[PDB]
């Protein structure tokens, strides 16, 4: 058998509360919103959060890339609630923060989150029109994650008791030293350090921060577009994703001991999986596009499923398939895999 409890997972990211509601076309027009696009909240969207809560159907689900990864991972290991994922981030002790913390803990995540007063809790207006979602994100409190919180006994212990470390690329936009504290911690606990490249702009605008974390990164996870901009960052003039993966194994600095893994998802095409033993492609199940609700956090759901599989000690291929299952399940919205 396996008879295995999952490894304690540490997740750090920018926590946002999805303020989610079906809205009229008039609502999008009112707020200058182009349908199906994700943008950061500007002066043009002033009042949207107060206005989306007028909708009788409005829902509040805890969100943000890394927090959704943590939620999906916990949703797979439901027998281990409070005993599996710890999430670190920065909220505010406002009403958006309470719902976020309280709805994430209830699902089984230990929320070792900071409470700042310098900004309100991070939130995302999820504007639904049929099966189309228009996103308006306000980073807020999430960006104010402090060295003080990372020193705090709660986070240090959370890290000390963890064996798997997942960081979204967005953590590098805040403060690299927070990430580098966990990088050192993964060395100490002999744990495993995983990044998600999260977005192309990370490799373009925050390349210095990424480069300081790469030697410590055991598993690099990205999609085709994130993978390609990585090659652009590295000066690898190629659009062959598998080639990029193999060079990310041996041509990107790695001082770790567990071994460098590179996972590149390719939406409709097979997931590239690379190690020091060569490149391998894991085909993604064929899907009907008239059954896709939205590709929102499909990469987050892949990463959530991939984690829960690694935490129970499944092999790398098995983890990619567990990622596929969860990704496509969340695409079409207890486990059955
Ligand atoms: C163009 C304009 C601004 C820019 O800076 C950014 C810097 C950071 C972010 C960002 C987004 C983000 N999240 C948090 C997790 O959910 C997904 C979105 N965390 N950090 C977004 C934009 C990059 C490119």
Author numbering: 0 to 332, 340 to 343
Copy the relevant paper text.
Adenosine kinase (EC 2.7.1.20, ATP:adenosine 5′-phosphotransferase) catalyzes the phosphorylation of adenosine to adenosine monophosphate (AMP) in presence of Mg2+ and utilizing ATP as the preferred phosphoryl donor. Recently T. brucei adenosine kinase (TbAK) was identified as a key enzyme mediating high affinity adenosine salvage in the purine salvage pathway. The overall structures of both TbrAK in complex with AP5A and compound 1 contain a mixed fold and consist of 12 α-helices and 14 β-strands that form two distinct domains. A common property of adenosine kinases from various organisms is their control via substrate-inhibition to prevent non-physiologically high intracellular purine nucleotide levels, and recently it has been shown that TbrAK activity is strongly inhibited by its substrate adenosine.
However, the diffraction from one of the apo crystals that had been soaked with compound 1, while still exhibiting several overlapping lattices indicative of non-merohedral twinning, was of sufficient quality to allow indexing of a single lattice, yielding data of sufficient quality for model refinement to at resolution of 2.8 Å. The crystal system was found to be tetragonal with space group P41212 with one molecule in the asymmetric unit and without any contacts other than typical crystal contacts with neighboring molecules in the crystal lattice. TbrAK in complex with compound 1 adopts an open conformation, and the location of compound 1 was unambiguously identified by its well-defined electron density localized in part in the adenosine binding site in the adenine moiety binding area, but pointing away from the ribose binding region towards the solvent. Moreover, only this orientation satisfies a number of hydrogen bonds to the protein, supporting the conclusion that compound 1 binds to TbrAK with the phenoxyphenyl moiety pointing towards the outside and the morpholine being buried in the active site. Compound 1 forms three hydrogen bonds with the protein, namely with the side chain NH2 groups of N13 and N142 (water-mediated) and the main chain nitrogen of S64. The phenoxy moiety of compound 1 interacts mainly via hydrophobic contacts formed by F169, F200, F204 and F205. Thus compound 1 is able to induce the formation of the anion hole also in absence of ATP, which could favor ATP rather than adenosine binding in the ATP binding pocket due to favorable interactions with the β and γ phosphate groups. As a result, the intrinsic substrate inhibition would be abolished, which corresponds exactly to the recent observation of abolishment of substrate inhibition conferred by compound 1 towards TbrAK. As compound 1 is not strongly interacting with the lid domain, it is most probably not able to interfere with the hinge bending motion to close the lid domain.
